[PDB]
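[#protein-structures] MJ: dropping Multidrug resistance protein 1A here for a structure pass
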Amino acid sequence: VSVLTMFRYAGWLDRLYMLVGTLAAIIHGVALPLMMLIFGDMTDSFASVGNVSKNSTNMSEADKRAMFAKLEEEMTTYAYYYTGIGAGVLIVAYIQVSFWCLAAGRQIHKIRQKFFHAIMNQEIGWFDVHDVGELNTRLTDDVSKINEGIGDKIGMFFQAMATFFGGFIIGFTRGWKLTLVILAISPVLGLSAGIWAKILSSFTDKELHAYAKAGAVAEEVLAAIRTVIAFGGQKKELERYNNNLEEAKRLGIKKAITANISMGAAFLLIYASYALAFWYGTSLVISKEYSIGQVLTVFFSVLIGAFSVGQASPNIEAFANARGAAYEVFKIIDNKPSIDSFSKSGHKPDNIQGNLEFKNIHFSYPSRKEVQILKGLNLKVKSGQTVALVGNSGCGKSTTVQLMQRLYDPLDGMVSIDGQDIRTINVRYLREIIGVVSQEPVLFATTIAENIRYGREDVTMDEIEKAVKEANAYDFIMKLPHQFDTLVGERGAQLSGGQKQRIAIARALVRNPKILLLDEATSALDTESEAVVQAALDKAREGRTTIVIAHRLSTVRNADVIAGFDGGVIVEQGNHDELMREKGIYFKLVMTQTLDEDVPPASFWRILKLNSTEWPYFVVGIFCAIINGGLQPAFSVIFSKVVGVFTNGGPPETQRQNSNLFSLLFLILGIISFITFFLQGFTFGKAGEILTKRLRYMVFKSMLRQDVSWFDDPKNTTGALTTRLANDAAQVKGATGSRLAVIFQNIANLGTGIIISLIYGWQLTLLLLAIVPIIAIAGVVEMKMLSGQALKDKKELEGSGKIATEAIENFRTVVSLTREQKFETMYAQSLQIPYRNAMKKAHVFGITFSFTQAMMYFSYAACFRFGAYLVTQQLMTFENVLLVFSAIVFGAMAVGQVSSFAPDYAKATVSASHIIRIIEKTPEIDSYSTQGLKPNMLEGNVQFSGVVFNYPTRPSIPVLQGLSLEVKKGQTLALVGSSGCGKSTVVQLLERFYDPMAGSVFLDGKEIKQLNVQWLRAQLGIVSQEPILFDCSIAENIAYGDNSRVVSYEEIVRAAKEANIHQFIDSLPDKYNTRVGDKGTQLSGGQKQRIAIARALVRQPHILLLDEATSALDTESEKVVQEALDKAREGRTCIVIAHRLSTIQNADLIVVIQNGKVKEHGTHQQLLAQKGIYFSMVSVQA
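AK: finished. structure tokens for Multidrug resistance protein 1A:
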């Protein structure tokens, strides 16, 4: 029902070809086991031939007769085999792909045209509800899924089952025993894969839990970067960040350890079962003689038949996820629930006029529970007149204008256009008789001529001319270049808003409506253009019956009748003078109103260079990958020898050889493969593991040892920094992971395959590699064209989608309604191009897959053809033919693994490129010397002379210009300024966060410019507005080690004693040992600040700095901190920039700073004697 038929709906001839393609899909899937049925038949005769060939040791020429005859007979069969299947698989392939396009093409185009139509046909509803953009976003993403759902995936789906159901048919008929054995190994292989999901999901969350700590430390620190710098607590965060990484790495290796155990064991159970299938498969031959090895190989193919089921599930998942998502929204997608608007029939008034009538209308907006904005209404406006409505709290008048256009059916009552109800008449016609001017105009992106043409489809520029000329819009447009053909670029913001609205009036003027609706058209506009547009409105009035709502009473003066609402409740009606006479609601208002990243530059091999530099030793891991590499072909070699000697060899000795090779297939793989895979995994695993440490180490420290506009004023963000730490280290981990993987398969194929390739007849080698690279490139060139079409497809619908998205985001198109079909008209022409392109890719995708399978039969052809014929012609052998199959599985593991790790090499390379350029850094200030920290430098007399400053934004109009100050030791230097900066900046420059553009600053008289960065920050009293508390023990919070300073219990006691935070310290559990409770969630600012104060006097700075410390606070908290602050200072130099001028009254030197320029400076009463900026500051303080 709703699930399937509509998903597939219509398509009369489409449905017919849909089955033809389906039909063609079956015989395609059927062909593959039939192709493998052939493999047994050729095996059978060749085996019978081999049995007599080893059986000779007497006659020779006899072996030259019959054995070659059968082979020649087989050569006769060979030709009809690849061809019979090849011509078959070629044709039906091109057919099954036409399903992917031709069926999908007409369906989607049918879906698109109705969907795009039904949306505009829902009318009011989208404004009533949902997302109106996020909605039309996902929905168009959903229709994209349909192409994946109704495409050849289904054709592929039937193909798989044909190999599945059709595959097992042949198996069971030719025996029921091997099936069961194969049926027995299915859950076991599913069991091992079950270990995987448990391991992956569990180990991911652990690592996530581990790096979360590393992430959390990086989280607050990078936010607290300004805090840590001043106090120089970097090296502690340094050590911790290494500690969390140490744990995150150990969970990493165990994941790798266990993973390799699973992946290793997973393949064991495959090869063991694979061996077990043969051992019981062989036993039915030697002592039994039922199978000649036909089905034995064929039952293996049933596993290949079983893998198609594994290939089937995604296609089902592709269909189902397409089905479910589409049909549920399909109910919304299609039809026209409508039934308040529609498009059609109804009554056409020819009366060419109508007195507007509103009668007892009770209405509510579709917000449901929201109260009725309008409860009852009575308004009747005579023809030719102009009625004015007004209000206060908002809307309720706007409702009356909205209902008149029948945009909302009233709950009770009726609105009568002319004498008749509005609900009888055709809506399309109604909209045309109603012009509407909204307060905020909108212009579609087109010429001004076209935006008017959107008002009425059939029109000529003469009417366009007369329209604007009467609307006085004909001035700015002429001066404007391109004239009427002038486009409106980048949506609607180009020109003056007043001109925009004026055009909208001209648009409504072409409409020549018999009703005119003005909603606050004059509102939200400059005073000058208002009078201009008003005149246009005035010239748009007097000729047409109208109703106007705005908040400008100047325009209401000339109205014939005014009606009060104030919330939508009707009260007064009549002429202006009559209203003012009442001195009512009207009169009352009148007098009252009188995050992305990744710059382009790449690595270019510097990766492995820096990697090996950071990778101290690992030659055992890769060498282990090599011995495992050459291990793979041995399997392909052993099995080749098994059936090889089984095919060519006599009845004697058959048991031992098969027995000997069977065990060999086990121990060479099962014993060794598990070892080497786990052996390498422990190596390259820990390799990537420790790389994750050193990198993130050498990054975060390279990040912390540099600030300088990467931190102070970056265009970046906290998330952007953390993101860098995550992806980069994770990617390069895969980069190295891709290295060993390739080298592993490299020797596995190139190295060993060649050795095997070398023992061929040298033509067989060439002929084989005349296939594999060609089919590889053929598979590659397909991938390019595939994405090439996919991208080109996305671009075409993009332009169509944008102009589509343009329409739905603009809901005002429905008030004119002229463009309803007109918009869908352009979309049709817009959608017409991908349609032909869909037809175009039908042929393109059709030929690609066809050619892909065309190389398949050609491969098996040349394999057995040349394996027969000339080789059959002279010295036909059991070898070199199965070695071809060996070279194939090497060609299969090459493309599969290499192309898989190809994009892994990509994102890593890019991510590595970022992390490399970042780690180069620009260390700037770390240690050096620059000064000797003289014993006479304690003092604290701070000099400022001719200091100018700007934070690193060049044309930012620097806040400091021509600034000079001075402060004596042991006294408070007060500071006060307007807002923002120059307050804060002064304190910042003393931290030497940024060296000023010009001038100099001195502390003992020594040059800060030439002073050591560290020691300058060794004595500082910095206290911010809202102090950031690191999550840790408050005791460890109270004491932040400046350099060597150990946590001192007796000291932090004095800290608490002075900071008056000892109150909380006295009581409460754990006392000093109390954690902040998840980012200090249990404490308020006053408490936090006391601790910050305690942090300051621990260091015992000779210089204290208070940046708006008491700015956020209240009541006793303000006084108790001030008590601490006052007691914190007066022993040493301090600078307070605080905005509290009531508590500044005790200060030694108060300084008035005007935007970089100190205006007045001196003691309070002295400045108080003066007048200027400062006295005003106190005057405004009240």
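MJ: nice. The radius of gyration is 42 Å.
AK: one more thing. The chain has three domains: 1-345+595-930, 346-594, 931-1182.
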